[PDB]
Amino acid sequence: QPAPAWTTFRVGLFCGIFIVLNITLVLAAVFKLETDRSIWPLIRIYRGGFLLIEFLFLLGINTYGWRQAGVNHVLIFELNPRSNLSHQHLFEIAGFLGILWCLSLLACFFAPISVIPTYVYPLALYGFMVFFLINPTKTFYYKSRFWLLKLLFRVFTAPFHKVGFADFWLADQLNSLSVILMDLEYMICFYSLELKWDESKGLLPNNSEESGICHKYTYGVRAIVQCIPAWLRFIQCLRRYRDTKRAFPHLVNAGKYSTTFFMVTFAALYSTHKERGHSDTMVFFYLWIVFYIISSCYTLIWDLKMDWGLFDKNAGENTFLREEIVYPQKAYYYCAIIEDVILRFAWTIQISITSTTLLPHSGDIIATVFAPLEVFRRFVWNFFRLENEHLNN
Amino acid sequence: QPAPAWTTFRVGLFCGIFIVLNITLVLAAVFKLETDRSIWPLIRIYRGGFLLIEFLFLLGINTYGWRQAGVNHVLIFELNPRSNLSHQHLFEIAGFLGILWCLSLLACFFAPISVIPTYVYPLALYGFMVFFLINPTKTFYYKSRFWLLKLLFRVFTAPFHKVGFADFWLADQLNSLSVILMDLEYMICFYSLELKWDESKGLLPNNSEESGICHKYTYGVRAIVQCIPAWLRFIQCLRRYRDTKRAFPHLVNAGKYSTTFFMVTFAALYSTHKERGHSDTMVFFYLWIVFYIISSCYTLIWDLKMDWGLFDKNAGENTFLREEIVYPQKAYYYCAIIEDVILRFAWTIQISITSTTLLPHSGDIIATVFAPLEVFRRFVWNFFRLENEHLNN
Ligand SMILES: CC(C)CCC[C@@H](C)[C@H]1CC[C@H]2[C@@H]3CC=C4C[C@@H](OC(=O)CCC(=O)O)CC[C@]4(C)[C@H]3CC[C@]12C
Ligand SMILES: CC(C)CCC[C@@H](C)[C@H]1CC[C@H]2[C@@H]3CC=C4C[C@@H](OC(=O)CCC(=O)O)CC[C@]4(C)[C@H]3CC[C@]12C
Numbered sequence: 143q144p145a146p147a148w149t150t151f152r153v154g155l156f157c158g159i160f161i162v163l164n165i166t167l168v169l170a171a172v173f174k175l176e177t178d179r180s181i182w183p184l185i186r187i188y189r190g191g192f193l194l195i196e197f198l199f200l201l202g203i204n205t206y207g208w209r210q211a212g213v214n215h216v217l218i219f220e221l222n223p224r225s226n227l228s229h230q231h232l233f234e235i236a237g238f239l240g241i242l243w244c245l246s247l248l249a250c251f252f253a254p255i256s257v258i259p260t261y262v263y264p265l266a267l268y269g270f271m272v273f274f275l276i277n278p279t280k281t282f283y284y285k286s287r288f289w290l291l292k293l294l295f296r297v298f299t300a301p302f303h304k305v306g307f308a309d310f311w312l313a314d315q316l317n318s319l320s321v322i323l324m325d326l327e328y329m330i331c332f333y334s335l336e337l338k339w340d341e342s343k344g345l346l347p348n349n350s351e352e353s354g355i356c357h358k359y360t361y362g363v364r365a366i367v368q369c370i371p372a373w374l375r376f377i378q379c380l381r382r383y384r385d386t387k388r389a390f391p392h393l394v395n396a397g398k399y400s401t402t403f404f405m406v407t408f409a410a411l412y413s414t415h416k417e418r419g420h421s422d423t424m425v426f427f428y429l430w431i432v433f434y435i436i437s438s439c440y441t442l443i444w445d446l447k448m449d450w451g452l453f454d455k456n457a458g459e460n461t462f463l464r465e466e467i468v469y470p471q472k473a474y475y476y477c478a479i480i481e482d483v484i485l486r487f488a489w490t491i492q493i494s495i496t497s498t499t500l501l502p503h504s505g506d507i508i509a510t511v512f513a514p515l516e517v518f519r520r521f522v523w524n525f526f527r528l529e530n531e532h533l534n535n
Numbered sequence: 536q537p538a539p540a541w542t543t544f545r546v547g548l549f550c551g552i553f554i555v556l557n558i559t560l561v562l563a564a565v566f567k568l569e570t571d572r573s574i575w576p577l578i579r580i581y582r583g584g585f586l587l588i589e590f591l592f593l594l595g596i597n598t599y600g601w602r603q604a605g606v607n608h609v610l611i612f613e614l615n616p617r618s619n620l621s622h623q624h625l626f627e628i629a630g631f632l633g634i635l636w637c638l639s640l641l642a643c644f645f646a647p648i649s650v651i652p653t654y655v656y657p658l659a660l661y662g663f664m665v666f667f668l669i670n671p672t673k674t675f676y677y678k679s680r681f682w683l684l685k686l687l688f689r690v691f692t693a694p695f696h697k698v699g700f701a702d703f704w705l706a707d708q709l710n711s712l713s714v715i716l717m718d719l720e721y722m723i724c725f726y727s728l729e730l731k732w733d734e735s736k737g738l739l740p741n742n743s744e745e746s747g748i749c750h751k752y753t754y755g756v757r758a759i760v761q762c763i764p765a766w767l768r769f770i771q772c773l774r775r776y777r778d779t780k781r782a783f784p785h786l787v788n789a790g791k792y793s794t795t796f797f798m799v800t801f802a803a804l805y806s807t808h809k810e811r812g813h814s815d816t817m818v819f820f821y822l823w824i825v826f827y828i829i830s831s832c833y834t835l836i837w838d839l840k841m842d843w844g845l846f847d848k849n850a851g852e853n854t855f856l857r858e859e860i861v862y863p864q865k866a867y868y869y870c871a872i873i874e875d876v877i878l879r880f881a882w883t884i885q886i887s888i889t890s891t892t893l894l895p896h897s898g899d900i901i902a903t904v905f906a907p908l909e910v911f912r913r914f915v916w917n918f919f920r921l922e923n924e925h926l927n928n
Binding site: 144145147150151152153154155156157158159161162163166 | 537538540543544545546547548549550551552554555556559
C-alpha cells in the first residue's frame with residue numbers, strides 16, 4: 143500500500159532543507175571560520191550525531207531493499223504486522239534530526255546573539271534528541287520508540303533475559319557504532335573538568351599540564367568504553383550457549399569477541415609502556431601485530447562463511463557463492479566481498495588508534511576520516527546477514 | 536488518479552530549497568547589502584519575474600479547487616480529457632523558477648566570480664525562462680508549453696481569430712499582469728539607452744539629475760504598453776459583438792474596457808505636463824480622479840452582478856447569493872466580496888501617501904507593495920468565475 147503524499151512531501155522537504163544547510167555550512171566553514179582557533183572538539187562532539195543520522199538513512203535503505211527483495215523480515219524480527227515502518231518514515235526521521243543537527247552546528251559557528259558564547263548548543267541538541275527518544279506522550283511514532291526502548295532495556299541487561307534475533311542484531315549494530323559512545327565519554331569529561339564553565343569566550347588554546355585529560359587513559363576511563371559492546375555480545379553468546387547447550391557456534395563466538403578484548407587491553411598496555419618508556423616496549427609492539435592478525439583473520443572467516451553463508455560446497459554455477467540467492471546480480475556479492483576485507487582492517491585500525499592514544503597529531507584525523515566507513519560496512523553486512531537468516535528458516 | 540510519489544518528492548524538495556533560499560536571501564539583504572547605490576532599478580529588473588512565479592503557484596491552488604469543488608473545468612477549457620496537468624506539476628514548475636530567481640538574485644547580491652561582474656545574471660535568468668518556454672525538444676511538458684505558446688499567439692492576434700473560453704480567460708489574466716510588461720520595457724530601456732556597459736558592477740549613485748530617462752513617460756512609451764492588454768480585450772469584445780449580433784452583454788464590456796484608455800491617457804498627460812508648468816494641471820487631475828471612480832465602479836458592478844452572478848433579485852434562503860452553490864462556506868463568499876471591494880478601490884489608499892508625504896521615492900514603494908495584490912484578486916476571482924461558468928454551461 144503506497145504511503146500518503148504528505149509523507150513523501152515531508153521527506154522531500156527535509157531532504158532539500160538538509161542539502162541547502164549542508165552547502166551553506168560548508169561555505170561558512172571555508173570562508174567565515176578562522177584556522178587559528180582549534181576546532182577539533184567541535185568535530186569530536188558532532189561526529190556521534192552525524193553517525194546517527196547516517197545510520198538512520200542507511201537503515202531506511204536496508205528496509206527498502208528487504209521489502210523489494212522479497213525477504214519476510216517482519217516475521218524474522220517478530221514485529222507486529224499491523225504497525226510497521228517503511229523506508230519513508232525512517233527517511234523523514236533522519237532528515238528532521240539532520241536538520242536539527244545542521245541548525246545546531248550553524249548556530250555554534252556563527253553564534254548570532256547570546257550572553258553564553260557557544261557551549262549550550264551541543265547540549266541543547268543532544269537533550270532534544272534524548273527527549274524525543276523518551277517522550278512520555280503518545281505521538282511521533284510512540285509504538286516504535288516504546289519498542290526500541292524495551293529492546294535497549296533487554297540488551298543492556300543481557301545476561302539475564304533470553305536472547306532473541308533483535309537483541310543480537312542491535313548488539314552488533316551498537317558494536318559498529320561505538321564511536322558515539324566514545325564521543326559521549328569525551329564530551330562528559332571535557333564538560334566536567336576541562337572547560338571553564340564559570341568564564342566567557344569558551345574554547346582557548348591549552349598550555350597547562352592538566353590539559354587533555356580525556357586524551358589520556360587515566361586508569362580505565364578509556365578502554366572499557368571501547369570494549370563495552372564486545373562485553374555485551376560476549377555475555378549474550380555465553381547466555382545463549384547456556385540456554386541451548388550447543389558447543390560449536392557459541393564457543394567459537396566467545397573467542398571471536400574476546401579477540402578484540404585482548405587487542406584492546408594489549409593496546410592499553412602498549413600505551414602505558416610508552417608512558418613508562420620500557421626497553422621491551424618495542425617487543426610489546428610485535429605481539430600487538432600478532433593479535434591484530436588473529437583479530438581480523440578471525441572475523442573475516444566469520445563474515446563470509448557463517449554470517450553471510452558463502453563458500454558453500456554446493457555452489458555449482460554460482461562461483462564462490464551459495465546455491466540459492468534472491469538478489470538479481472552477483473556483482474553486488476563480489477563487490478561486497480572485495481570491500482569487506484578492505485574495510486575490516488581500517489575498522490580495527492581505527493578502534494586501536496582511538497583508545498591507544500597513538501598518533502598524537504594524525505590519530506584524530508585518521509579516526510575522523512575512517513569513522514563513516516564502518517557504518518557503511520555494517521550497512522553492507524545487513525543485507526546478506528538477513529538474506530542468509532531468511533533462507534535458513 | 537493519484538500522482539506518482541516521485542512528483543510529490545520533487546515538489547517537496549523544491550519547496551524546501553525555495554524556503555531556505557528565501558530566508559538566506561532576506562538575511563543577506565538585511566546584512567550583506569550596502570546602501571550607497573540606488574537599488575531601485577534592481578527591483579524593476581526582478582519584481583516582474585517574481586510576480587510570474589507567484590502567479591504560477593496561485594494557479595496551482597486554483598485547479599485543486601476545481602478538482603474538489605466539482606467544478607468541471609477540463610470540459611469547458613477544451614482540454615484533453617485523458618491528459619491533464621495536476622497542481623503538483625504547477626507547484627514544482629513554480630518552485631524550479633523560484634529557485635532560479637533566488638540563485639540569480641543571490642549571485643547579483645554577492646558577485647562571487649570577478650569576471651562577469653553584474654549584468655549577465657538577469658539576462659541569463661530571463662533567457663533561461665525564454666528557452667524553457669520555446670524549447671523545441673519533446674521534454675519537460677511538451678504538450679503544456681506547446682498549448683501555451685499556441686494560445687499566446689492566438690491571444691496576441693485578437694482581432695482576427697475566433698473567440699473562445701481559454702482565449703478571453705488568458706486575456707483577463709494578462710489584464711492583471713501588465714506590471715511584467717512595464718518592468719520588461721524598463722529593463723530594455725535601461726540596458727539600451729543609459730547603462731554604461733564598459734563598467735564593472737557600476738557602483739555609481741544615481742542621485743545625479745541626469746538620471747530618470749526611462750523612469751518618466753516622456754515621449755509616451757509606457758502608456759501604450761500599459762494599455763496593450765486593455766486594447767486586446769477591447770478588440771476581442773468588439774469581435775464578440777460583431778459575431779453575436781447582440782449588444783446586451785458586449786458593448787457595455789467594451790465601454791468598461793475603454794474607460795481605462797481615458798484613465799491612462801489622462802494620467803500620462805498629467806505626468807508629462809507636471810514639469811512643463813501647465814498651471815491648469817488640477818483640471819486634468821480632477822478628470823483623472825473622476826474617471827478613476829467611474830472605472831473602479833464599472834468594474835465593481837461588472838464583477839459582482841454579472842461576472843459572478845451575485846446579488847440576484849430572487850435569492851431565497853441564501854441572502855445576497857445565488858441559488859445553487861458548490862463551495863460550503865458562505866463566509867468565503869462574503870470575504871471575497873469584501874476583499875474585492877477593498878482591492879478594486881485600493882488605488883485611493885496609495886494616492887493618499889502620494890498626496891500627503893514628502894518622502895523621496897514614494898510612488899515606487901507603494902507600487903511594488905501593491906503589485907502582488909492584483910494577482911491575488913484575480914486568483915480569488917477565478918474560483919467564482921469558473922463556478923458560474925460551470926453552472927451556466
Ligand atoms: C567500495 C566499493 C569497492 C564497493 C561498494 C559496494 C556497494 C556500493 C554495493 C555492495 C552491496 C550493494 C547492495 C547489494 C544489494 C542491494 C539490494 C537491491 O535491491 C533490489 O532492488 C533488488 C530486488 C529487485 O529489484 O528484484 C538494491 C541495491 C543494493 C542495496 C546494493 C547497493 C550497492 C551495494 C551497497
Ligand atoms: C486576506 C483577506 C483580505 C481575506 C481574503 C479571502 C481569502 C482568504 C479567501 C476568499 C475565497 C477563499 C477560497 C474560496 C473557496 C475555497 C475552496 C475550498 O475547497 C476545498 O479544497 C475544501 C472543500 C472540502 O474539502 O469540503 C478550499 C478553500 C478555498 C480555496 C478558499 C480559500 C480562502 C479564500 C481564498
